[PDB]
Design a protein around this ligand. Structure first.
Ligand code: ATP
Ligand code: ATP
Ligand code: ATP
Ligand code: K
Ligand code: K
Ligand code: NA
Lengths: 215, 431, 431, 199, 215
């Protein structure tokens, strides 16, 4: 697998460093000379180029890359003209970082394989943590079902699993318990819940809200 | 590390060839450990300096090893490495594509693998055709087992700018022969012009559509070989040793052959030891310049010479920029060229200094030997069989640096220290 | 026109001085028109190449013309022209101040007139004192009539980097004498170190307050004289002709003397015709480099050599700028240093090429003579008395361009057309 | 013929590419470095020069060009200073791209041989197609007669030429048919509009 | 000792010239090319570098310097980011020039060894001279004791030390009396005060003000 990341920002530079850490061949493309010098150690090859121009795109050797990530999300013109050239170059997978809803509509038209909203998706996740101080991290399996990593309150301290009638009253199955820094995958009845230990609990999106409120 | 792989891989082929040549099977006479290493290194660096005669010292298998070393080192170590990978079906990664960019001296990685397919297909196509054209002359003279093999050996040797010849007189029996002169000079001119120049002419059939590099090589080679032909013919017209007891038609053929052979084939029709000192001095400048950045030749290239020459002349005319063929040439081009020429002169000067300490020889032969070894031309005035054990070790180093390039050899052991800090300007008078 | 005035004025001093030697008063023997023109050119270019022995061919009046030509040619043509104008009382204008800027190769016109006051006052002072120091040795050996003139002739000869000697053996009879060795080596080291260096040394007595050029010349001369003294001593230690039949004390004197004389005086204490070929090669690199941007010495200067050497090493290490003594060096400084070096090598190549056509001489003697003539050193291996009439005419042209500088000679007849237009970039591969 | 095009915009860049396609010697001058690099391959000679300077204009050998096209139409100072210099250099044919009505009046005084409004000539041509969607292209022979390439409607389908009375009833001469098919017609401006309404 | 001065302003450039005058090894770092060319001759080592970057900071051998003076006091981002780097590099003494109250508080958190307000200290000293024109220079020993170099008026002319009751009535000691380029350390009774001469005095802060008004 060969990867090219166009635009080394806070989002593009994170993909370069994580893919290089896993041991992948990453080409880092940027228009800023300071950015390219910064990511020379965190990429297989770092090139100064302007991706909106097709002649500079073919010099990089861009047709050899299966995945191209256009992580430019503040210039709508530079982002949409880059994914137009790459789509015209028959690049199989183009992942584009968008800015607003109208930018998402343009990239959907001109053939972006996946459109990403990093700050919008994180802002929604943070706003669930601000609204509910119990949650720490959640994953939406659907629009009505979720896995929520709860935080133990004072009333859950010194409470065994079978004492908590979560399985019957709420219909939520506890998946794991992060006990004092040690996980417990599929806890068996019964395990004592301490003062502050993560309770990975899977259930309906409305049902876990009842469990948080009723404690 | 892209320059470090090339130096290590190029050094391993010298070891492998030295082992294969030192086997009892590959030679008819006992061979020293240094002469086998010198012959192997003179083949993969594609020079043609022969301490021992190729035809008698080596068997048919030994000469088959030489053709393997010439073809591998002529086209480059990394060219065949990619083809092995592509034959085995393994994918070409970005890391393996960066090695080809370093070996072909390309600035960008755009289409650097597609150039390898073209240059390998073009190499075996024109080496097969020229071996057939040489067969219509060589086969009636040496039979079928030897005539077909000698034509095959010379077509590969000529195309890769090697200068290895099976006969004891290196092409000196074909001074007036138009068939050998036309075919062989057609091979090392096109084989050393550059792989990118051939690729550009093949895909673009009109001269105005050529790039600056292609127009520099096509016009520069035509002008440089014409001046060298004029210099050899005028200076050697009265020489009794060479070009004196020849017909007027043979004088044109030998002067034309000796005009193009120092860049950098190293074949010959006349004895360079009996030439005048005036022609040898002009040949030294001739073989300090090679041809083509990505080619089978060596030395500082023809484009490096023109870039430096035009940069000075534009400065002396008061111009503020270097313009060739109505195109500006940027400062990063000028700086690399200077490094290639200054580093090459320093290495040549160290070779002449070290050979004068070691060898007891005329000074003209020592300077001619070092320029011929560094440019990997292989022409001698009569010194290479007379070298000592210490002398041949110096020539082996010179041939190695000459082929791989002074820049990529230094970049093997020069730690590129990156720093973004700057310093206040200094005023030093360089008049 | 500032380069045109220098070229015209320099050539006229050769022609005017040539007639003064052709007079029957000047010489004892009849002197040819080319020998008088050679000796006149060998003095105003301050080279010291002698067709005929200076002591025997010329009388006292003829040698007085030599001292005038050495003094006028040693300090430069425009240096004495400033003194004449100031004495007569004519105003030194901006137009006249631009010639002085060009004569000293100064980039700035600030204080350039005051430097001529400083440099001429110092030059007449040091030549007068050094004659008195040499008077205590040359007077008891040659009386008062000849000993006083011998010390006066050599103090002017040594300081101005001439190498002319009245005796048939050019300082070969004073190998082990510290008075002749130390005083003369004091003169051409200080006389070739640079006029601007000596001005910067006297006005600031601390090394940290020196300019970049002054720090380069003091360190560069000390580094280069140390390597040159170690090379001559090691290579020539066992040689029977030179440095072999000498005591260890006298070995160090001749090794010290032969290391500093190629830059660019031309005196000797050992016969250069009997030196090894290894030592002669290092002397060519030694006398291709000069000493001091504005001094009595010539060749490419030491600061030009350090600028190009450091700019290449910075490129090979991946650095983006040339830093010497924690000071960055701008692009205009680098390009002028390479224009001097490339132009000088081409002219030296033309001199070696043209002499091999003309002279029937060994190649090393022709190469040694052309570097000596272009560098205005004057060291010989035994060729200058053996030159033909056509061979001498080439050396005069070489000595003219060598002393006047390759750049100023070209700027005389090179059109300076300024065009503000620019061109699109073209990519060329310079491997 | 040798042509010089000064200013490689959307207009001048089109003239360089078109004349180079036809096989002509085109000099492409532009003050912008990136513009000249893009059109360097599309011109016989491309220079990064400022054309308001006479010294730079004489460096190009501009006196050897019979046709000079000044395709600067957003800088009146750069456009008028350029065409005053070229009139001084005795250029036989200077063609200038204008910006507004006042730029047209300056260049007419200072000696422009032909003044071109590319967006104004196209905008009037486009607005004629917007108003009546039947037309596709037209050429005005005079102020009242035009050769309008009409588009055949649904009522003109399967109708022969002899069935159409455009020659006598409308006084319009049909020239060609490009098989709704393109119908090239010629007639008076008022007479053609009668045929469009009545099919 | 080896000193480094980062930022060659009016304050930073004055420390470079003064420490070089006294004969110290000073490294002058500035991001501006023109400033470094000015102080290249007034510093042992002068570098054009950005001090907010760790790679440029480690190239200077900045760990070899005992004192680093960060004389950036208008760019809060550049000033606080620099001393965060130097605190990580275990510099024994980091002296920082501040801008306002809030910039002082950031540098206190991230461990600035000494924080300097050049214009605020000089403004207060000038505003003491504007309020009372009899003072010329002063130094505060504490919040209530000060050494003030006063200016003699006409009423103190032709008066001796014993005639003045500063020691007993005012409780203040006269330290020295400058006399037209001549200085008299620790005067003995009695010396006649001239028309306009320095009247260096030491005492309570409020007791000096009573002396100035009355005499
Ligand atoms: N045409 C271009 N080609 C290549 N790189 C570009 C181009 N235009 C901008 N960039 C680079 O892309 C990077 C990220 O783009 P930008 O800062 O506009 O996006 P962003 O949405 O603000 O990013 P982030 O918030 O993740 O930093 C920058 O380093 C910028 O220099
Ligand atoms: N003095 C000049 N000399 C040469 N070229 C110039 C000069 N001034 C501007 N140009 C170039 O001329 C080109 C076209 O001019 P400009 O952009 O002002 O016109 P325009 O009205 O926008 O035209 P278009 O619609 O064709 O783009 C530009 O690329 C500009 O850089
Ligand atoms: N990141 C940086 N690294 C190094 N030097 C910097 C940096 N940012 C600014 N400087 C330089 O520091 C110097 C002083 O900073 P600045 O001018 O912002 O402060 P100031 O409060 O105005 O100081 P002063 O009153 O002494 O002039 C300037 O010469 C500025 O160019
Ligand atoms: K060869
Ligand atoms: K000399
Ligand atoms: Na427009």
């Amino acid at each position: 697998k060969q990867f090219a990341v166009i635009g080394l920002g806070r989002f593009g530079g994170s993909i370069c460093k994580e893919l290089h850490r896993m041991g992948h061949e990453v080409l880092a493309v940027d228009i800023n000379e300071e950015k390219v010098n910064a990511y020379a150690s965190y990429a297989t090859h770092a090139v100064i180029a302007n991706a909106t121009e097709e002649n500079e795109l073919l010099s990089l050797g861009i047709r050899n890359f299966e995945y191209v990530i256009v992580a430019i999300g503040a210039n709508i013109q530079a982002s949409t003209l880059t994914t137009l050239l790459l789509k015209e170059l028959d690049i199989p997978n183009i992942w584009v970082k968008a800015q607003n809803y109208y930018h998402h509509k343009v990239l959907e038209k001109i053939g972006a394989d996946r459109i990403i909203h990093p700050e919008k998706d994180m802002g929604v996740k943070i706003a669930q943590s601000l609204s509910d101080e119990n949650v720490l991290n959640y994953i939406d399996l659907s629009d009505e079902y979720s896995i929520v990593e709860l935080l133990a309150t004072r009333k859950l301290d010194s409470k065994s699993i079978i004492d908590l009638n979560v399985r019957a009253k709420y219909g939520c199955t506890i998946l794991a318990i992060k006990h004092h820094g040690d996980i417990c995958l599929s806890p068996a009845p019964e395990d004592i819940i301490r003062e502050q230990d993560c309770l990975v609990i899977m259930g309906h999106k409305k049902d876990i809200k009842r469990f948080e409120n009723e404690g | 590390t892209p320059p470090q792989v090339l130096a290590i891989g190029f050094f391993l082929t010298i070891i492998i060839g030295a082992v294969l040549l030192m086997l009892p099977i590959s030679t008819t006479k006992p061979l020293s450990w240094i002469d086998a290493l010198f012959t192997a290194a003179s083949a993969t660096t594609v020079t043609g300096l022969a301490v021992v005669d190729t035809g008698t010292q080596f068997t048919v298998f030994g000469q088959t090893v030489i053709m393997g070393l010439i073809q591998i080192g002529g086209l480059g170590f990394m060219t065949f490495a990619v083809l092995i990978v592509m034959i085995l079906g393994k994918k070409i990664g970005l890391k393996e594509r960066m090695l080809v960019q370093e070996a072909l001296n390309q600035p960008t990685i755009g289409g650097v693998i597609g150039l390898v397919k073209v240059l390998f297909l073009f190499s075996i196509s024109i080496e097969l055709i020229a071996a057939l054209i040489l067969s219509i002359r060589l086969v009636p003279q040496y039979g079928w087992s030897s005539g077909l093999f000698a034509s095959l050996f010379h077509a590969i040797s000529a195309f890769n700018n090697a200068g290895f010849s099976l006969w004891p007189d290196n092409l000196m029996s074909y001074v007036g022969d138009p068939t050998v002169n036309l075919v062989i000079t057609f091979l090392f001119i096109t084989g050393g012009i550059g792989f990118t120049v051939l690729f550009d002419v093949m895909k673009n059939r009109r001269f105005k559509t050529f790039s600056l590099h292609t127009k520099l090589m096509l016009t520069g080679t035509l002008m440089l070989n014409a001046i060298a032909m004029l210099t050899v013919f005028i200076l050697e017209y009265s020489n009794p040793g060479t070009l004196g007891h020849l017909h007027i038609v043979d004088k044109l053929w030998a002067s034309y052959f000796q005009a193009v052979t120092p860049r950098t084939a190293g074949f010959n029709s006349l004895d360079f030891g009996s030439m005048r000192e005036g022609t040898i001095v002009f040949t030294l400048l001739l073989m300090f310049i090679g041809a083509g950045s990505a080619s089978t030749a060596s030395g500082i290239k023809l484009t490096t010479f023109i870039v430096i020459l035009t940069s000075v002349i534009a400065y002396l005319r008061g111009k503020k920029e270097t313009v060739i063929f109505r195109r500006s040439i940027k400062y990063p081009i000028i700086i690399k060229a200077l490094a290639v020429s200054v580093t090459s002169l320093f290495i040549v000067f160290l070779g002449i200094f070290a050979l004068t300490i070691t060898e007891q020889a005329p000074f003209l032969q020592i300077v001619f030997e070092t320029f011929s070894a560094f440019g990997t031309v292989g022409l001698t005035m009569g010194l290479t069989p007379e070298l000592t054990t210490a002398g041949k070790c110096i020539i082996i180093v010179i041939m190695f640096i000459g082929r791989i390039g002074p820049l990529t050899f230094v970049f093997s052991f020069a730690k590129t220290e990156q720093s973004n800090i700057r310093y206040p300007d200094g005023e030093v008078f360089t008049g």
